[PDB]
Symmetry: C2
Subunit: 164 residues, 2 copies
């Protein structure tokens, strides 16, 4: 009975990993390049490069690839996050505003850059996917709730990450 | 400078009130009846009656108006929530699953019944609205961010509610 609030927690972690995995595959399907491992996707979206590319994918008229800061992430891999990376997240936000995705789904720059609330970012990706799909601008995102598994260590890691 | 994290907080509350107002009007537009005041909408969705009605509106195959418990909410007005109201929320959930709304957006029964996380409910309504609109089953939800105002007292009440 007391272990219920300890197993339900395991479930949340698992479900979030599935949603992450789904976001990862869909972005890859759209971008045509590999994204970091599902287990490291959150940290891998922080510099906003992938998001800005996603923006270019559906709203090219608003997000030019040549104007993305550290497009190859060489700077990021080398020194880490830089204040200028924030512009990338903003380009993505502008991309979504251009195509009509309702703002209630938008995360704040800090939510992704300072990783204050990455889940909010994932949820937005998912909503953007549903919106893009209905406009016939991107493939449908997958649903992997039960077809995908993760090691006990990964669920455990995600669990503690979703708490403290 | 210290009042920034106290004004930004005011903004969040305001934004949420706008989202609630938008969900309220859209549901009314779909249902053809009045819903409680935007300021009391959250508490007013707890018994799931309006949600089940929303369910019947887009998936009558799954939700029969006659199988909604306390459809007139007479029980509710008399005595508060009753365990049997939980079924209404569940009918709404089944409605969404039937039309194919991605599960990532679904709140848990407890989130709305025990009011553990009503915002999750509101965000789901918005995703549902976006989806239903693309299916041509319902009118488009409005964007009221700037067009609408609330009293200071209301912004304030919502603010403290969104914290402790």
């Amino acid at each position: 009975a007391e272990e219920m609030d300890e197993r339900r927690r395991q479930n949340v972690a698992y479900e979030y990993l599935c949603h992450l995995e789904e976001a990862k595959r869909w972005m890859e399907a759209c971008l045509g390049e590999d994204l970091p491992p599902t287990t490291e996707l959150e940290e891998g979206l922080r510099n906003g490069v992938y998001l800005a590319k996603l923006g270019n994918f559906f709203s090219p008229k608003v997000v030019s690839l040549k104007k993305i800061y550290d497009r190859e992430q060489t700077r990021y891999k080398a020194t880490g996050l830089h204040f200028r990376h924030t512009d990338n997240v903003i380009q993505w936000l502008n991309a979504m505003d251009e195509i009509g995705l309702p703002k209630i789904f938008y995360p704040e720059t800090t939510d992704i850059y300072d990783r204050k609330n990455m889940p909010r970012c994932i949820y937005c990706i998912h909503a953007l996917s549903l919106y893009l799909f209905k406009l016939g601008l991107a493939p449908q995102i997958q649903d992997l709730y039960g077809k995908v598994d993760f090691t006990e260590e990964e669920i455990n890691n995600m669990k503690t990450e979703l708490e403290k």
